[PDB]
Structures are given as structure tokens and as C-alpha cells.
Amino acid sequence: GVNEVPDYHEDIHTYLREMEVKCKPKVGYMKKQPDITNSMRAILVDWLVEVGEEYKLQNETLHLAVNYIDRFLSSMSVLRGKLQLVGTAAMLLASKFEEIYPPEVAEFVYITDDTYTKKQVLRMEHLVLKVLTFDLAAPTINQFLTQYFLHQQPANCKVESLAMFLGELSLIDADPYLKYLPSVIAAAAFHLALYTVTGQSWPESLVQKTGYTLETLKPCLLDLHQTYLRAPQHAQQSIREKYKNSKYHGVSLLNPPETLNL
Amino acid sequence: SMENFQKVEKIGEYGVVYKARNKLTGEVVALKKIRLDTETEGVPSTAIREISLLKELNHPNIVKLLDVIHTENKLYLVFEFLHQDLKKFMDASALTGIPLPLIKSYLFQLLQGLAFCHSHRVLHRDLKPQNLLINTEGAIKLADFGLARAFGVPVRTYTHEVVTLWYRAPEILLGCKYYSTAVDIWSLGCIFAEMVTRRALFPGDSEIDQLFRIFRTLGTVPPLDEDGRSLLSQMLHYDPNKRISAKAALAHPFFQDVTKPVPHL
Ligand SMILES: Cc1c(O)cccc1-c1nc2nc(N)nc(OCC3CCCCC3)c2[nH]1
Ligand SMILES: [Mg+2]
Ligand SMILES: [Mg+2]
Known part of the structure; x- marks a missing residue:
């Protein structure tokens, strides 16, 4: 419906892609x-x-x-x-x-x-x-994620909460995540969440929308996966704690995948 | 700081809006003066939004923010000067009426402005004739972005207390969890009808009266041609999902012969 705003979503996405570069x-x-x-x-x-x-x-x-x-x-x-x-x-x-x-x-x-x-x-x-x-x-990881979430068929709440968790962990570590744009972090987080929970991958429809492929996303994905795997030992633990709550489906309790397969 | 500006007169209103002239360049501007609550709440959120959103929105039918002048205690927003608002223009035209070509021109420009907002993920949320400004050359521009907000896709729940009552969409009145770009189109629809009659379409006295006015009119504007009425009906569709977008409205047959007349000022 108009809530997801079909006459403008492509124009908006384009505009945010411009502005994330200027607000970087x-x-x-x-x-x-x-x-x-x-x-x-x-x-x-x-x-x-x-x-x-x-x-x-x-x-x-x-x-x-x-x-x-x-x-x-x-x-x-x-x-x-x-x-x-x-x-x-x-x-x-x-x-x-x-x-x-x-x-x-x-x-x-x-x-x-x-x-x-x-x-x-x-x-x-x-x-x-x-x-x-x-x-x-400023455009944020979240603004891209919520658009990416519309490409799930059907929506999966654990996927969404996990993607949000991963994007939020990225906020913590300037090294490496300052190198990456919000749209890219969001894409890596969505793919990694989608894979962890359902076995699925960055859908073709989002290839079309964003121009990004798993090849493009590889470096960010590799960093995010390591961040995910090391999360229980990181000195900072508030995001993990937060995402144990049922509000976020307990996603921080899920086991990260051992490997990504590329 | 403000030393190059000479205040000419008060234009009305928080904060205070003056007409001023730049002594060095000759430019006439409108100055909006905003008190900072330096010991209490700081910069008002309405100013933060107005400024931040107006800086992004560069378009011929959106009021131009020229500068922001800071002091410890006040913020002045320097805007292009426009010569009056649409409400005053309608009142002045109460007996004469507004020629159709000008109504059409104004509606077309309002929709261009609005489509630009929505394409840049900005909801206006206070479209009303007092907030639409005209010049002597036939332009009209969206103004007063103090109630505006940058939205996400899909929308979240946003502030309920939005839009002046007479211009308020049914989905807001009824307290729907979500509202979107459709709310601005509803307002423009009301404004379209009001340019034609020079009377508010739904002048409700209360939320219930507002709703009853809407229901009894649309189901529970004589001088308009068929195309006009078709467009108006689509702007006032009850269902926000079916309500026409600004982008699609610009392609309506009503606009096929649009021109840009000067107002009878
Ligand atoms: C309307 C009017 C006259 O009747 C006579 C002389 C000037 C004006 C008038 N010109 C204006 N020019 C600009 N840029 N802003 C204004 O207000 C921004 C408001 C948007 C409307 C709500 C308050 C801030 C103006 N008001
Ligand atoms: Mg250092
Ligand atoms: Mg970054």
C-alpha cells in the first residue's frame, strides 16, 4: 500500500544512495x-x-x-x-x-x-x-534494511531482527566499518541474517535494486561474519544483551553459521 | 551578523517573521527569528527539522532557505521573500473569483513541489493555504516546513497531532497506526476545491464534525469541469492506498493545457 510508497520507493532509494556518500x-x-x-x-x-x-x-x-x-x-x-x-x-x-x-x-x-x-x-x-x-x-543502515526487508517473501521476523542486530554491531567498531557505506553494511547484514536463519541468499530482486552482488558484498560480508563469530567475546556487550529480549526474538542467542560458502 | 539587514516590517508568525532588505545587494528577504532556550531545552526540534529538510529540498515550488545566521541566543532563517500567501489571495478574490488557468497553474506547481518532497522522503504534514506562498510572476511555493518529517520506507508510526483540522486526512482523524504521502495529497485536494470556491471544503468545528462533513460530502464543487472533478475525486479518495500520488496527478488530463498566468494582484 501507500505505506510502502510505490510511486516513490525507487526515487527515494536512489536519493539515499547519493546522500550516504555525502554524509559519510x-x-x-x-x-x-x-x-x-x-x-x-x-x-x-x-x-x-x-x-x-x-x-x-x-x-x-x-x-x-x-x-x-x-x-x-x-x-x-x-x-x-x-x-x-x-x-x-x-x-x-x-x-x-x-x-x-x-x-x-x-x-x-x-x-x-x-x-x-x-x-x-x-x-x-x-x-x-x-x-x-x-x-x-542522514541515511542509515536501518533505512536501507527496511527497504531490503520488503523483498522477503514472506517476511520473516527472525531474519529482520537478526539483520538489525548485525547492523547495530557494526556501529561499535570504526575499524573496519567506517570503510563501508550504510547500504553495503545493510546488504551484508540482510544476506548474513537471511542465510543464518533460512539458508537463503541475497535475492536477485535486490541485485536489481541495488546493483550489489555477493561478489561486491564479499569484503563487508567477511568482516561482518567475523564480527558475528567474535561477538560473545567483544568488550562491548550491550547490543548482544539487548537482542536477547523477546522484543527482538532472542536473535543474539542464535548460533552464527560456521562458514558462508561463496 | 544581521548588520546588513534592514527590517522593513513585521509579517506575522513562533518565532517572528519579518520582511527585510539586504542593504548591500538590495535583496528583499523574509527573516524568521527563532528564540533558543539556552538554559532549558536548547534548539527546538521543529527548527532542527525545518532547517535540515529545507537544506535538502531545492526546487522552484519549495520556498528557498538562503542562509542560517547563528548567535548564542537566536537563530535567524533567511528565506526568499514572497509577496503573499494563498489564503490572503483567496480572500482578496472572494468576490472576483480566481481564473481557472491560474487555479490550474497553481495546482500543477503545488503538485510538482509536493512530488519533489515525497521523492526526497519528506512529508510536509501542514499543507494549508496560509502555508503556500505566491509571487507577482505566477509562481506558488510550499512553505513552513516546521511540521515536516523525513520518512522511511516503509513508514513507521509518526506524530498524531498533525495537519490543521480542516485539511486533515481521514486516516489521521481515525487514528490509523500508519499514515504516508497520501496525507499531503488529501490536503492539496482540499486546497484545490478551496481555490475554486474560495471557501474551505471541510470547515469542521471538532474532530467528529470534521468526519461528518467529509462523510456527507463524499458518501457515508459546481464550477469544475469533468477533468477537474475527476482529479479532485482521486485526490480525495478515502482509501489512502487508492488516493492518487502527486507524481501520477501531474499526468492527469486536467493539466494538458496548463500555462503560467500572472495573478490579478
Ligand atoms: C503572507 C504575507 C503577507 O500577507 C504580506 C507580506 C508578506 C507575506 C509573506 N511573505 C513571505 N515570504 C516568506 N518566505 N515566508 C513567509 O512566511 C513563512 C510563513 C509561512 C506561513 C506561516 C508562517 C511562516 C512570508 N509571508
Ligand atoms: Mg587517535
Ligand atoms: Mg560505515
Whole structure:
């Protein structure tokens, strides 16, 4: 029906494919950050997952926040003591953009338990807006996934939740996932979820839509599969925890496939 | 900062909208001044959406955002100046009427603007004549994107409190879980009929009165030709799935002879 919006879905997909390229953070920006590291970023991203769960925020909001943070750090040097401030402000902004009922600013100060004043959060909000030039409507892994999900016949909830889980794990690790565009991560996640659950592969219809094949997707897929296999040992565990919940069909409990077959 | 702008007059309205002129270039602009809640809630979400979405939307029938001027305490949005809104134009034309060629021209341009929005995954959600701006050369443009939102495919549940009552689609009034691009088309349909009669089509006093007005009219515009009525009926289809899209409406026979007259301003 009109909910899935047949006169515009191809135009929209094309447009998002253009915009993900323009909203792409700088790959390896962390090498030009003298005071912060990929490990610190993973800590921050994992904490934002917890925040999104505490406040029952959309997954899309989380993804946006990450994109905001990565683009901000692509042009602004930040000291470690302030990295959480940047993150808090990004999450506020994402919430204001994306949520029907965003948490109030006071909730965001409260979640940084003591660290920053309200004033600092609000000033940082403004600075983030300036640095991003109010360019906040960024394409996310999720926006591509939800379109890819329409090509399932029929929809499978475990597949969807697993694809979302995999895309979300990618947020955590700048190395390697900053190299990959959201549409590509989403395609790799959808294929890997589809395979894990049903035995099926990236459908031809999505080859047609995206121009991507399993050959194109190979490098991302290889990284995602390793990420999936190593997930129980990663220092960051909030996404796994989250996806044990029945809301997400317990998908983080499924066993990853041993091999991919290519 | 704002030192090159000379305020000319207040144009009405949160925040405040002024007509101004750039002293150096001569350009006339509309300035929208937005208070920042610097000790409380910060930048309003409505401003965040309006700005971010307008920056992406570059089209002849969408109001042009020219600049954003920041201070610690205020944000000013600098827009192209347009000379009045469609509601004022209709009122001024209450006795004379609006020639058909101009109605057709305006509808055609509104649909081009809207199709551009929808093709860029933006719902307007507040189409009403007060929000549609005209110039002296025959253009009309979508304005006031404060209630707009960037949507995903397929749509999720979004804010219920959307669209002014008279222009509100039945799927919203009835509290459907999902609404989509069809809600903007419904509004434009109402506006089409209103350009023809210069009276609101469904001027309800309450949600129930609104619904009853819709039901008794469409089933539970005299001066319009057959093609016009055909298009109008398709814009006002109850079923959002069957309601015509802006893209398909641009190919309707009603528009076969469209021109761009100047308004009787
Ligand atoms: C309407 C009008 C007059 O009658 C006389 C002189 C100017 C104008 C008028 N020109 C305008 N030009 C622009 N860009 N925006 C406006 O408001 C944006 C609003 C969209 C409508 C809702 C508030 C913000 C304008 N209002
Ligand atoms: Mg470093
Ligand atoms: Mg990436």
C-alpha cells in the first residue's frame, strides 16, 4: 500500500544512495585524533545503545547519533574527557530529529551521571549543529534494511531482527566499518541474517535494486561474519544483551553459521 | 551578523517573521527569528527539522532557505521573500473569483513541489493555504516546513497531532497506526476545491464534525469541469492506498493545457 510508497520507493532509494556518500564520515579520522581511539569510541557507542534501551528510543535514532558523532569527529579534535559530551549531544539531536517523544534535556544530563552540566550539553548541541551545518537527515543502515526487508517473501521476523542486530554491531567498531557505506553494511547484514536463519541468499530482486552482488558484498560480508563469530567475546556487550529480549526474538542467542560458502 | 539587514516590517508568525532588505545587494528577504532556550531545552526540534529538510529540498515550488545566521541566543532563517500567501489571495478574490488557468497553474506547481518532497522522503504534514506562498510572476511555493518529517520506507508510526483540522486526512482523524504521502495529497485536494470556491471544503468545528462533513460530502464543487472533478475525486479518495500520488496527478488530463498566468494582484 501507500505505506510502502510505490510511486516513490525507487526515487527515494536512489536519493539515499547519493546522500550516504555525502554524509559519510572520514575513514580513519581516528588516526588524526591525538587524544581518542577506536576503543574509546566503541565504549561510547555501547553506552548509547544502553541509553536507547533505557529510554525506549528507536533504533534509527541510535544510528543517526552515531553518524553525527563520526562526522563531528571527522572535523573536530576532541579530548577524551569530552567525548561523552559530544555523544550525549548527538543522541539529543538524533532524538529531537527522529522521536515523536524525545527525552527532555534533563534526562540526557542525568544519564551522564554527574560528569557534565546541563549548560555544557546545550552548548554542545549548538556546536554539533554548527559543525554539521544542520545536515541531519542522514541515511542509515536501518533505512536501507527496511527497504531490503520488503523483498522477503514472506517476511520473516527472525531474519529482520537478526539483520538489525548485525547492523547495530557494526556501529561499535570504526575499524573496519567506517570503510563501508550504510547500504553495503545493510546488504551484508540482510544476506548474513537471511542465510543464518533460512539458508537463503541475497535475492536477485535486490541485485536489481541495488546493483550489489555477493561478489561486491564479499569484503563487508567477511568482516561482518567475523564480527558475528567474535561477538560473545567483544568488550562491548550491550547490543548482544539487548537482542536477547523477546522484543527482538532472542536473535543474539542464535548460533552464527560456521562458514558462508561463496 | 544581521548588520546588513534592514527590517522593513513585521509579517506575522513562533518565532517572528519579518520582511527585510539586504542593504548591500538590495535583496528583499523574509527573516524568521527563532528564540533558543539556552538554559532549558536548547534548539527546538521543529527548527532542527525545518532547517535540515529545507537544506535538502531545492526546487522552484519549495520556498528557498538562503542562509542560517547563528548567535548564542537566536537563530535567524533567511528565506526568499514572497509577496503573499494563498489564503490572503483567496480572500482578496472572494468576490472576483480566481481564473481557472491560474487555479490550474497553481495546482500543477503545488503538485510538482509536493512530488519533489515525497521523492526526497519528506512529508510536509501542514499543507494549508496560509502555508503556500505566491509571487507577482505566477509562481506558488510550499512553505513552513516546521511540521515536516523525513520518512522511511516503509513508514513507521509518526506524530498524531498533525495537519490543521480542516485539511486533515481521514486516516489521521481515525487514528490509523500508519499514515504516508497520501496525507499531503488529501490536503492539496482540499486546497484545490478551496481555490475554486474560495471557501474551505471541510470547515469542521471538532474532530467528529470534521468526519461528518467529509462523510456527507463524499458518501457515508459546481464550477469544475469533468477533468477537474475527476482529479479532485482521486485526490480525495478515502482509501489512502487508492488516493492518487502527486507524481501520477501531474499526468492527469486536467493539466494538458496548463500555462503560467500572472495573478490579478
Ligand atoms: C503572507 C504575507 C503577507 O500577507 C504580506 C507580506 C508578506 C507575506 C509573506 N511573505 C513571505 N515570504 C516568506 N518566505 N515566508 C513567509 O512566511 C513563512 C510563513 C509561512 C506561513 C506561516 C508562517 C511562516 C512570508 N509571508
Ligand atoms: Mg587517535
Ligand atoms: Mg560505515
